């Protein structure tokens, strides 16, 4: 549905993050 | 007077094309006038030369080994010294025209070929063929060609700069001449090497007898059969491509025809012409039911008409609808559209359609009934 | 019929050439302009029973002398055949909007008209009066769009110029 | 807040790569509609009060319980908030329609509206029915000529209805 | 009451169906089952048929 | 014959130069107002039937010696021929404006026209006046300044195409002189 | 004495022609089936023999409206030229019935196309071979 | 609903003709037959034409043909005129 | 025709014509001469009958010829008079046949459908037929007018 | 009613309702609320609908109220408006039932016989119904007016 709270929709920073340094979003 | 002048006369100073050419078959196909403009690109000189080789040789392949003959006389046209008429005079007196159309030909074939090449027309009658035969026999081929070009008929029609083309005059004096013209040019995929038989008779296709049909039609006044005018023809290369109520194009003749179907069709057409000739007399006399009352109803309809908008209240209520040239007399949009269905809805016209198509079906069957002995039959 | 297609492939056939890039490039304009010239086609085709009506009485309103005896529109069936001719001409304009050229007009209404209208005493001015009355009554955002109106008026005035 | 042009750029920086030509003629087509899209938003903002009042009137002629004494639409105050909650969603649907992307619609309209309506006791399904009745009137009002050139607008009214359905499923 | 069976009547006048087929498709029409099937019990329907 | 595109090609072929980016600023500007060129040609060919009868009748009320007995426009045949070469000249000028180049005008219409009109005895003074009235009608129809016919156009400036067709008409006039 | 296209009927409003030209509204069927008509025609002998031994006879005997384009015996005799021979010679081997079936099935069209139906018309369809 | 709902021998309904026609079938035959009465000479009723050509529904053709065969009639021609052949769904 | 109808009604029952039916056929063939005379009189006075009936109709129903009415204009009025002539001809047929079979088989079966499809008010046609009936009965004797109006009344009843 | 008609059509075949019929009943009971809303709007605007339809009818058909017409006089005009009100009420019934069973069982079966026995032109009633249809559809939305005119069109077709 909607993006997580606070996250401006369309400009996440985890977009093209590598898997070897990806951080799970709480 | 619907046609003012012919095309044999020189063109008037008021018209761009001749009046006869605007509503003949001229406006349809590729048999049109190709005029050389007064200054030409080396691009657009070849547009003229290709039309000349299409016309003067009358549909010939002409490999470029057979073009190195004519590279001298084309160069005087490419410079701009030779006109188009002097170019076709130089091309007719070359040797490749001779070996194709003079050097294996009967004299009738050669005369009827240069009538088709140097002019856009068929041989008209016998008396104009004989004068050209006697022109050749005492003066030779060289003066024979100038007998065609240097007279009245070339310069009044083509001038010196239009290429020759098959003329769709619209006004034919001897009539059949139209059928001879349509049977001389055999449509877009024919030639004179093929129609003259100069390849099957020839040896490895060279040295062929340029034989001719239709020389019995020139001498006796016996006109061309319809199958050479309707099947392979410039009429269908320059066709209008529309919906004809009788389709004039012939169907190909069916294999395995019998005499029984011909007998029933010949009875059908004899019933139809007898029905037509009696339906004719009743038409335009008892054609309408409200026709006797047409003179009666006009005086009842004359009364109570108001010019200004709004009349015919018919009580104390409303306006109303009038003041149209069609609408003052009760007619609607369907009143003029009844003329557009008059095959089906008309009683006289139905018979005339089915008469013509039963005739067209009839005419092909006896062409198929010209073959008798080793001819297997079916049971429909 | 003279159209965008039949022009460029007869120019190629007369020269004996394959369809070049100019031949393909000419049909690309037949893709752009056919959005505008076809939009007027169903507009004229759906409302063709109000345009013939409005042109026919304008023809007789300009020329009231035609209803005199001895003239062209003296009786009722002659006026009935007169409205049929304006219907024929609007049908040919509808066809020419569909082909994209002046093909059907030049084949079916223009060629040979100047002989039959002089032989049968039909005045050509009364013919062009109805076409001109259809021409000035084109409300360019209301009847159709702008370019469809341009394409419609360019075929009406071609018939006007050809009839006079 | 993104428009549809900023969407492809925000996905282009992420891979760190230039827009290829297929994305470019995807965008020049979008530009080439252009006038149709603003004709659509012009038709919705010209008739906004009519859309809102007719949808609310149909909602209460349909569901009389909201204006029943004790209902969530009872009294002048509750009604004034309900009148222009719908006008807020209409405003943000028109913003998302002119942007070409539902990024402003999710950011500042639909973000946290569900627990907002839960914390007040507002029935979210009736809000969704009001959204659907505004949607039907907006797509009905969108495809009339009204003095515009004739053409097809179907891919735009589908997107306009999609914004309304996105608003309707997120509230409830 | 102005009831009518246009297709059936034309088909039977032309001879494409016989009077037997005409009666058969009259008996299974909606008019027949509204007048002689719905307001009765099945035992009475048999007797009327 | 040539057009606006091929005109720069024969200019580059004279020096064996490729058509570079300098040469294409003149041609990409020819594409930008190509719709104005089509809209300008359409306005002329719409009223081309009025333009000849407008201009030739203006040339007559200039000079009644043409319809005088023995005059050059005295016969119905001669009047029809004058109305014919009004239309031919208007036809080739509209070809040249559509092509963007005057090449088709002066090898298919004007090449050999002066000695033709000298050999026929056609008076050149009235030939200049019949062309100048058509030129004045052309600038009025392109800039939408006719007295009693206005045509629907998108707003903008069109004096460049009007200047171009004015440049074609005095080419015609200097050719027949 | 009047009206060339008379009509059928009896009673008032009649003309003198019985209803249906013989008082037969719905007439019986006089025509034979496809393989029957072909077998009596005398010219499609090879076609009927191939239909029977190939098994395609069951398809054309169905009531479905078909347009068959049966080639005459001349047509089959004209396969002895080189080009068509190189393509169809292996259909003579007794194990190649599966391809003979598709070649034969390509001649059967669903629907009834009369010759008057096709004047100045270009129609594309699928035959029973699926092509 | 349809004739093939499991009824056979030992059913409560009496043994009868069972059509395979799908319910509300619209397939139809065209049949020509002759059926002499073979009872008119002891009932003494008026005659009727016994030569018939008619369209019969697919759902009734079997019972009809069996009735014709019962009473000594001869069937001269049969034709399926309405409906496809070996169509799985779409006979209704 | 009376003979035809007697024959069919006897044919359905599979019997010859009883002496009552033959009696009635006899009485019909005996009256055929005055039937032909009456048909003469009605037939050859058709112009006045149609004209005067059209007048009485247009004075009784001015709406049909009012501006826009179904019979509005010269052509529509002519067509309406044509219809009245049709029905007068059918009445003469019925008079000579001795029964309304000719009138009913031609011009009455499906007349409502036709006139509804044409947009014509059937009551106007009934009024025209009544006016023609009065005009035509004015030219006959007492018993002749009674027998002749017998068919106009049937045509009016069928045209309600 | 849709439920009733589904039940009878399933009853003749001696079977339960198939899932298609149950699907359609479900869709009907789900739309019943907007059906009641539309019936509300048409029901409580009856005075304007009948009045404006009567106007358009009397301007389109001045003969029926002309001197002598069927609806000529105060009482006859009142009776005609009464009939128009009858048909508007039947249309509301049909809208809530979801099918033309109420309209057709009441007011359509035998309507031609009744209006022929009364001397009323049925085309005038059709014109009045069409005028009322335009007036009533003017007060609805696009989809609502489309669904509401769906029944006026059936009533017009049955009343040809
Ligand atoms: C059709 C009306 C529906 C409805 C509306 C309703 N809303 C409220 C109360 C609030 N609504 C909001 C909503 C917003 N605040 C925002 O800033 C935005 C922008 C994204 C929205 C959508 C808030 C904050 C309130 C509380 C404040 C207040 O309104 O006083 C109310 C009742 C008011 C109250 O709860 O006291 C109603 C009635 N409810 C319905 O029943 C309709 C379906
Ligand atoms: C070097 C190894 C390496 C990888 C494999 C990826 C692994 C990976 N994939 C995704 C991210 C994703 N991975 C998928 C995968 C799939 N989508 C489908 O529909 C199928 C299930 C499947 C394709 C066949 C999708 C859809 C996302 C986007 C998830 C999202 O945006 O919510 C993410 C989150 C960050 C991002 O958005 O890119 C990561 C770390 N990254 C790496 O660094
Ligand atoms: C020297 C003697 C001589 C003639 C007698 C005429 C006759 C004639 N008419 C046509 C050609 C024609 N002739 C007719 C004439 C008619 N069609 C009808 O239905 C009417 C019965 C009849 C007019 C009264 C028509 C309609 C065409 C045109 C056919 C077409 O364009 O397809 C042609 C073929 C050339 C052409 O296409 O124009 C000829 C030779 N012309 C001549 O040169
Ligand atoms: C197919 C293409 C097409 C058209 C060209 C028009 C054509 C057209 N419009 C009107 C009818 C009309 N036409 C107009 C339009 C105008 N009146 C003016 O004074 C302005 C000049 C112009 C708008 C800018 C108006 C206002 C009417 C109604 C009243 C009238 O006749 O003027 C009529 C008369 C019959 C009728 O009422 O329909 C016709 C033929 N409609 C079409 O469907
Ligand atoms: C396919 C294109 C096509 C046409 C354009 C017309 C052209 C045309 N009109 C008429 C025939 C006619 N055309 C008119 C028409 C008019 N008279 C006038 O004064 C007005 C100018 C105009 C009405 C507005 C009349 C009055 C006649 C009858 C003349 C006559 O019968 O002699 C005829 C003779 C045959 C006929 O009666 O139809 C033809 C070919 N027909 C066509 O098939
Ligand atoms: C202030 C903002 C603003 C605008 C929106 C536009 C409004 C506008 N739209 C169009 C142009 C258009 N407008 C439409 C739209 C429609 N046509 C229909 O039939 C539908 C009802 C509707 C779709 C929703 C279409 C389809 C075109 C172009 C015609 C076409 O593409 O064929 C044009 C003509 C110029 C052009 O075509 O580009 C203009 C000026 N101008 C502005 O200044
Ligand atoms: C390809 C290009 C091309 C043209 C430009 C025209 C021009 C042109 N006009 C004429 C011929 C003529 N041209 C005129 C024209 C005029 N005389 C005047 O006094 C006026 C100034 C002017 C009309 C406005 C007249 C009057 C004649 C006829 C002379 C005569 O008949 O003796 C001729 C000689 C042929 C003939 O006699 O018709 C030519 C070539 N024709 C063409 O083919
Ligand atoms: C002494 C004789 C004499 C004439 C016969 C007229 C002819 C005439 N008209 C124009 C001038 C013009 N002539 C036209 C032509 C036309 N205008 C139209 O609206 C139609 C479309 C078309 C003919 C039907 C146009 C468009 C102009 C420009 C101004 C305008 O009319 O708006 C000119 C040049 C400038 C001028 O003198 O005005 C002349 C000589 N004037 C004269 O002095
Ligand atoms: C196939 C036929 C065909 C045509 C007739 C033209 C039609 C045409 N003209 C213009 C468009 C235009 N035409 C003009 C021209 C003018 N405006 C004025 O006010 C002056 C009177 C006149 C100068 C001569 C201008 C200024 C524009 C807008 C600018 C432009 O599009 O270049 C446009 C672009 C705008 C649009 O309609 O979408 C088109 C398609 N193009 C075609 O494809
Ligand atoms: C008393 C003599 C007699 C016979 C035999 C007879 C046969 C007969 N078989 C029928 C159908 C049928 N018959 C079959 C039979 C077969 N399918 C196969 O693949 C097998 C080779 C074959 C069984 C051995 C099938 C499948 C149908 C159904 C056709 C269909 O539903 O389209 C029908 C159509 C009636 C219906 O089912 O609705 C009749 C009338 N009628 C008669 O009066
Ligand atoms: C109304 C017009 C009409 C006619 C004529 C008609 C005839 C007709 N004749 C029949 C039989 C018959 N018809 C005859 C007649 C004859 N045997 C002879 O040798 C003589 C030459 C001839 C008498 C002159 C016989 C013997 C039969 C019985 C055939 C049988 O039982 O097999 C039957 C079969 C019905 C039945 O008897 O069960 C019909 C339907 N039907 C009609 O609808
Ligand atoms: C033999 C039995 C028979 C009848 C009666 C008959 C009627 C008939 N009446 C017609 C038209 C017509 N009939 C009328 C009649 C009337 N307008 C009024 O207002 C009056 C109430 C009424 C005159 C009393 C009008 C106006 C038309 C033309 C309608 C139109 O074209 O719009 C037409 C169409 C055109 C034509 O006449 O061919 C037919 C076929 N045909 C038949 O075969």
From TrEMBL, chain A:
Q: How is this protein named in the record?
A: Uncharacterized protein
Look up and give the organism this protein is from. Porphyridium purpureum
From TrEMBL, chain B:
Coiled coil (UniProt feature): 341-368
Give membrane topology per the record.
Peripheral membrane protein
Query: What are the subcellular locations of this protein?
Result: Plastid, Chloroplast thylakoid membrane
**GO annotation, cellular component aspect:** chloroplast thylakoid membrane; phycobilisome
Q: Which GO terms describe its biological process?
A: photosynthesis
Q: Keywords in alphabetical order, please.
A: Antenna complex, Chloroplast, Coiled coil, Membrane, Photosynthesis, Phycobilisome, Plastid, Thylakoid
Is-annotated flag, keyword Ribonucleoprotein? Answer: no
Span of domain PBS-linker: 12-193
Q: Which domain of life is it from?
A: Eukaryota
Chief subcellular location: plastid
Say which family it is in: Belongs to the phycobilisome linker protein family.
Name of the protein in its database record: Phycobilisome 32.1 kDa linker polypeptide, phycocyanin-associated, rod
Q: What is the organism of origin for this protein?
A: Porphyridium purpureum
Lineage of producing organism: Eukaryota, Rhodophyta, Bangiophyceae, Porphyridiales, Porphyridiaceae
UniProtKB/TrEMBL annotation, chain C:
> Which family is this sequence assigned to?
Belongs to the phycobiliprotein family.
Question: Which processes are annotated in GO (biological process)?
Answer: photosynthesis
Q: Which domain of life is it from?
A: Eukaryota
Instruction: Give the protein name, as stated in the record.
Output: Phycoerythrin alpha subunit
Q: Which organism is it from?
A: Porphyridium purpureum
GO CC term (a single one): phycobilisome
Q: Give the binding site residues for (2R,3E)-phycocyanobilin.
A: 82
Q: How does it sit in the membrane?
A: Peripheral membrane protein
Alphabetically sorted, this entry's keywords are: Antenna complex, Bile pigment, Chloroplast, Chromophore, Electron transport, Membrane, Photosynthesis, Phycobilisome, Plastid, Thylakoid, Transport
InterPro entries with a match to the protein in the record:
Globin-like_sf, Phycobilisome_asu/bsu, Phycobilisome_asu/bsu_sf
Location of the protein in the cell:
Plastid, Chloroplast thylakoid membrane
- What main location does UniProt list? plastid
| A Pfam family of this chain | Phycobilisome
Automatic annotation (TrEMBL), chain H:
Which locations, inside or outside the cell, does it occupy?
Endomembrane system
Keyword annotations of the record: Membrane, Photosynthesis, Thylakoid
State the source organism's domain of life.
Answer: Eukaryota
Q: Name one GO cellular component term.
A: endomembrane system
Domain named CpcD-like: residues = 26-81
Methyltransferase recorded as keyword: no
Which biological processes are named by the entry's GO terms?
photosynthesis
* Principal cellular location given in the protein's record: membrane
What is the official name of this protein in its record?
Phycobilisome 7.8 kDa linker polypeptide, allophycocyanin-associated, core
Tell me the stretch of the parent sequence this chain holds: 41 to 132 of 132
């Amino acid at each position: 549905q909607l993006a997580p709270p606070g996250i401006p929709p369309g400009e996440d920073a985890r977009n093209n993050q590598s898997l070897r340094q990806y951080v799970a979003r709480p | 007077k619907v046609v003012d002048r012919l095309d044999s006369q020189p063109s008037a100073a008021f018209e761009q094309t001749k009046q006869v050419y605007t509503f003949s078959r001229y406006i349809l196909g590729p048999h049109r006038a190709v005029v050389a403009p007064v200054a030409m690109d080396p691009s657009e000189k070849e547009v003229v030369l290709r039309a000349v080789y299409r016309q003067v040789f009358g549909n010939a392949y002409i490999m470029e080994e057979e073009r190195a003959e004519l590279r001298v006389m084309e160069s005087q046209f490419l410079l701009g010294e030779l006109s188009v008429k002097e170019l076709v005079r130089a091309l007719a007196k070359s040797s490749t025209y001779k070996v194709r159309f003079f050097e294996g030909a009967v004299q009738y074939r050669f005369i009827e070929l240069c009538f088709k090449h140097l002019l856009g027309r068929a041989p008209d009658n016998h008396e104009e063929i004989a004068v050209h035969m006697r022109k050749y026999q005492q003066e030779g081929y060289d003066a024979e060609i100038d007998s065609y070009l240097d007279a009245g008929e070339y310069d009044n029609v083509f001038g010196d700069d239009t290429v020759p083309f098959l003329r769709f005059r619209g006004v034919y004096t001897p009539c059949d001449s139209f059928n001879r013209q349509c049977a001389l040019q055999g449509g877009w995929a024919n030639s004179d090497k093929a129609m003259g038989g100069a390849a099957l008779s020839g040896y490895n296709g060279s040295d062929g007898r340029q034989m001719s049909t239709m020389i019995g039609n020139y001498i006796s006044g016996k006109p061309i059969p319809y199958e050479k005018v309707a099947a392979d023809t410039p009429l269908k290369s320059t066709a209008p491509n529309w919906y004809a109520r009788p389709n004039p194009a012939l169907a190909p003749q069916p294999a395995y025809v019998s005499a029984k179907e011909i007998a029933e069709l010949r009875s059908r057409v004899s019933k139809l012409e007898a029905a037509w000739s009696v339906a004719v007399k009743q038409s335009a006399a008892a054609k309408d039911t409200v026709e006797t009352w047409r003179a009666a109803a006009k005086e009842m309809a004359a009364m109570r008409g108001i010019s200004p908008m709004g009349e015919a209240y018919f009580g104390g209520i409303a306006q109303k609808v009038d003041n149209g040239a069609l609408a003052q007399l009760g007619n609607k949009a369907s009143s003029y559209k009844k003329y557009l269905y008059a095959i089906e809805t008309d009683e006289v016209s139905r018979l005339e359609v089915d008469l013509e198509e039963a005739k067209g079906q009839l005419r092909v069957l006896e062409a198929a009934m010209a073959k008798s002995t080793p001819m297997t039959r079916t049971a429909e | 019929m003279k159209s965008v297609i039949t022009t460029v492939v007869s120019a190629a056939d007369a020269a004996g050439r394959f369809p070049s890039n100019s031949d393909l490039e000419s049909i690309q304009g037949n893709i752009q302009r056919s959005a505008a010239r076809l939009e007027a086609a169903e507009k004229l085709a759906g409302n063709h029973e109000a345009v013939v009506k409005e042109a026919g009485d304008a023809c007789f309103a300009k020329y009231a002398y035609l209803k005199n005896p001895g003239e062209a529109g003296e009786n009722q069936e002659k006026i009935n055949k007169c409205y049929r001719d304006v219907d024929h001409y609007m049908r040919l304009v509808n066809y020419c909007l569909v082909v994209g050229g002046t093909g059907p007009l030049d084949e079916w209404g223009i060629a040979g008209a100047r002989e039959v209208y002089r032989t049968l005493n039909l005045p050509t001015s009364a013919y062009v009066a109805s076409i001109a009355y259809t021409r000035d009554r084109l409300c360019v955002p209301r009847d159709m769009s702008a370019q469809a109106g341009v394409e419609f008026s360019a075929y009406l005035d071609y018939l006007i110029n050809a009839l006079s | 807040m993104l428009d549809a042009f900023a969407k492809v750029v925000a996905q282009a920086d992420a891979r760190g790569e230039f827009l290829s030509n297929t994305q470019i003629d995807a965008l020049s087509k979008m530009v080439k509609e252009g006038n149709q899209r603003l004709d659509i938003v012009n038709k919705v903002t010209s008739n906004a009060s009519a859309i809102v009042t007719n949808s609310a009137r149909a909602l209460f002629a349909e569901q009389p319980q909201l204006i029943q004494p004790g209902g969530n639409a009872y009294t002048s105050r509750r009604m004034a908030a309900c009148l222009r909650d719908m006008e807020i969603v209409l405003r943000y649907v028109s913003y998302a329609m002119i942007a070409g992307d539902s990024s402003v619609l999710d950011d500042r309209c639909l973000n946290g509206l569900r627990e907002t309506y839960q914390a007040l006791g507002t029935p979210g399904s009736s809000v969704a029915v009001a959204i659907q009745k505004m949607k039907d009137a907006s797509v009905a009002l969108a495809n009339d000529t009204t003095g515009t050139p004739i053409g097809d607008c179907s891919s735009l009214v589908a997107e306009l209805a999609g914004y309304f359905d996105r608003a309707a499923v997120s509230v409830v | 009451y102005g009831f009518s069976f246009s297709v059936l009547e034309s088909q039977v006048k032309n001879g494409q169906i016989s009077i037997k087929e005409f009666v058969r498709s009259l008996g299974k029409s909606s008019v027949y089952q509204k007048q002689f099937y719905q307001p009765y019990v099945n035992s009475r329907v048999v007797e009327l048929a | 014959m040539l057009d606006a595109f091929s005109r720069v090609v024969v200019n580059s072929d004279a020096k064996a130069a490729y058509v570079g980016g300098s040469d294409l600023q003149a041609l990409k500007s020819f594409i930008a107002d190509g719709n104005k060129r089509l809209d300008a040609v359409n306005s002329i060919v719409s009223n081309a039937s009025c333009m000849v009868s407008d201009a030739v009748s203006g040339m007559i009320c200039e000079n009644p010696g043409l319809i005088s007995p023995g005059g050059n426009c005295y016969t119905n045949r001669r009047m029809a021929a004058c109305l014919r070469d009004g239309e031919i000249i208007l036809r080739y000028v509209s070809y040249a404006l559509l092509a963007g180049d005057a090449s088709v005008l002066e090898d298919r219409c004007l090449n050999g026209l002066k000695e033709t009109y000298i050999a026929l005895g056609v008076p050149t003074n009235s030939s200049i006046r019949a062309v100048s009235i058509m030129k004045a009608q052309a600038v009025a129809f392109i800039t939408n300044t006719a007295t009693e016919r206005k045509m629907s156009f998108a707003a903008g400036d069109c004096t460049s195409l009007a200047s171009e067709v004015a440049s074609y008409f005095d080419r015609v006039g200097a050719a027949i002189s | 004495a009047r009206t060339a296209y008379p009509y059928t009927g009896s009673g008032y409003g009649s003309a003198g022609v019985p209803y249906g030209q013989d008082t037969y509204g719905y007439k019986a069927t006089t025509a034979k089936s496809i393989t029957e008509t072909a077998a009596q025609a005398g010219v499609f002998n090879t076609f009927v023999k191939l239909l029977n031994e190939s098994g395609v006879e069951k398809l054309v005997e169905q009531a479905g409206p078909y347009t068959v384009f049966a080639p005459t015996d001349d047509a089959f005799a004209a396969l002895l030229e080189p080009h068509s021979f190189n393509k169809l010679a292996t259909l003579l081997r007794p194990e190649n019935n599966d391809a003979l079936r598709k070649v034969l099935m390509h001649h059967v069209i669903p629907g009834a196309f009369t010759s008057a139906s096709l004047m100045d018309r270009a129609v594309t369809v699928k035959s029973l071979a699926g092509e | 609903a349809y004739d093939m709902d499991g009824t056979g021998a030992g059913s409560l309904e009496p043994r009868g003709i069972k059509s395979s026609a799908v319910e509300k079938d619209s397939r139809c035959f065209k049949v020509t037959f002759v059926l002499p009465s073979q009872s008119r000479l002891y009932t003494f009723r008026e005659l009727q034409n016994v030569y018939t050509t008619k369209m019969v529904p697919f759902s009734s053709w079997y019972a009809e043909q069996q009735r014709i065969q019962k009473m000594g009639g001869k069937i001269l021609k049969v034709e399926l005129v309405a409906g496809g052949q070996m169509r799985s769904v779409g006979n209704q | 025709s009376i003979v035809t109808k007697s024959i069919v009604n006897a044919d359905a029952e599979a019997r010859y014509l009883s002496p009552g039916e033959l009696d009635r056929i006899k009485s019909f063939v005996l009256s055929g001469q005055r039937r032909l005379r009456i048909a003469q009189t009605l037939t050859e006075n058709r112009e006045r009958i149609v004209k005067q009936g059209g007048q009485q109709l247009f004075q009784r129903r001015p709406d049909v010829v009012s501006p826009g009415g179904n019979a509005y204009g010269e052509e529509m009025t002519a067509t309406c008079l044509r219809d009245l002539d049709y029905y007068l001809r059918l009445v003469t047929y019925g008079i000579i046949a001795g029964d309304v079979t000719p009138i009913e088989e031609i011009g009455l079966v499906g007349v409502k459908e036709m006139y509804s499809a044409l947009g014509t008010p059937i009551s106007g046609v009934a009024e025209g037929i009544r006016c023609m009936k009065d005009v035509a009965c004015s030219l006959l004797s007492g018993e002749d007018a009674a027998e002749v109006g017998f068919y106009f009344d049937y045509t009016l009843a069928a045209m309600q």
